[PDB]
């Protein structure tokens, strides 16, 4: 709730002056943070996905959905309705709580973090980070995990352009290159 | 769009109900207010209509958009319907899950005397 109230108390204002918005609803707001973890190696070992889910459930608050394979493909030897990855679609209250914990204490533990890519936008304000390790989040014990399976964070917003959506994140002291 | 998804979710009931040729009680729910109207088997003309938007019912209640308000309309519609001569009808939930306000409206319509 801290970043949530920060948005309303500050930021709501800061963005109004930049793009001379007519109304307060025109300002981009952050909709959902979708944590994906396409484990993939679960074809060989079935438990390996259950280990990844335990890690996502630790990293986020809520428990992840086990995503099925959409179509069968020969390139990786998978079939229709096979559990291939994990996801969490966290939004609302716990979203802002996670979003604080991400930027404020998780990003800084990225190995040799110099600057995050400002050109990593979808052409519609929706940002996508990809973390290499789990260890960067302080929820994982060091002697528990035995495999470097990263996730990828995807911040979805209401902006109609990446330039409009950059300022939104940048206004939360987001480390860009 | 949400509306369009609610319309096509309802359509099956509507089209099945107009084929039978029955007098349907349409109930349009809204964040503020709940509506209800008994429509003739042809589908065009309305026989009875009531809602929390009507001041006669709005003046009485605490707030227009809740279970106790839905019961007040559900009573009202059925109270008029019996005066008109209507009794045997159907209940078009109109793409709204039969659970809260519409269930209260329906239960009030049953308890008022409208036998359906």
């Amino acid at each position: 709730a801290k970043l949530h109230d920060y948005y309303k108390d500050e930021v709501v204002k800061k963005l109004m002056t930049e793009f001379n918005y007519n109304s307060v609803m025109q300002v981009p707001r952050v909709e959902k943070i979708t944590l994906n973890m396409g484990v993939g190696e679960a074809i060989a070992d079935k438990k390996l996905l259950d280990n990844a889910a335990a890690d996502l459930a630790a990293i986020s608050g809520q428990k992840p959905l086990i995503t099925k394979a959409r179509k069968s493909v020969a390139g990786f030897k998978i079939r229709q309705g096979y559990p291939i990855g994990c996801k969490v679609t966290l939004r609302g209250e716990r979203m802002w709580e996670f979003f604080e914990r991400l930027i404020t204490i998780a990003v800084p533990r990225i190995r040799d973090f110099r600057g995050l890519s400002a050109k990593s936008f979808d052409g519609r304000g929706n940002y996508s980070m990809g973390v290499r390790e789990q260890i960067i989040f302080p929820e994982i014990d060091y002697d528990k995990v035995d495999r470097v399976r990263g996730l990828d964070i995807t911040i979805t917003t209401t902006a109609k352009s990446d330039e409009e959506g950059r300022a939104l994140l940048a206004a939360f002291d987001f480390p860009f290159r | 769009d949400k509306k369009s998804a609610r319309i096509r979710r309802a359509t099956r009931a509507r089209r099945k109900l107009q084929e039978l040729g029955a007098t349907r009680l349409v109930v349009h729910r809204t964040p503020r207010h709940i509506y209800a109207q008994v429509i003739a088997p042809n589908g065009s003309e309305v026989l009875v209509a009531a809602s929390t938007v009507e001041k006669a019912i709005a003046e009485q209640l605490k707030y227009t958009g809740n279970k106790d308000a839905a019961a007040a309309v559900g009573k009202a519609v059925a109270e008029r319907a019996l005066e008109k001569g209507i009794k045997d009808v159907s209940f078009d939930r109109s793409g709204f899950q039969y659970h809260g306000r519409v269930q209260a409206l329906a239960d009030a319509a049953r308890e008022a005397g409208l036998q359906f």
């Binding site: 630790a58 608050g61 428990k63 709580e97 533990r109 110099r114 600057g115 302080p138 | -």
Partner: protein
Amino acid sequence: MKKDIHPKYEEITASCSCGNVMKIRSTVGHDLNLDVCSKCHPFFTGKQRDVATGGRVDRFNKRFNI
């Protein structure tokens, strides 16, 4: 949220060596200890010190000095 199935999402106090005390809510346990934060990490100075590393002609002049 659906109760029972999720893990215990309890409040905890983050306290780094810098001095920034900070309450948060996460699935850890009792307390926390951090190295760095959004404040106190060298990215504002890091990019200043990292980019200005090159310099070959002055390095030669520092040896010869004439």
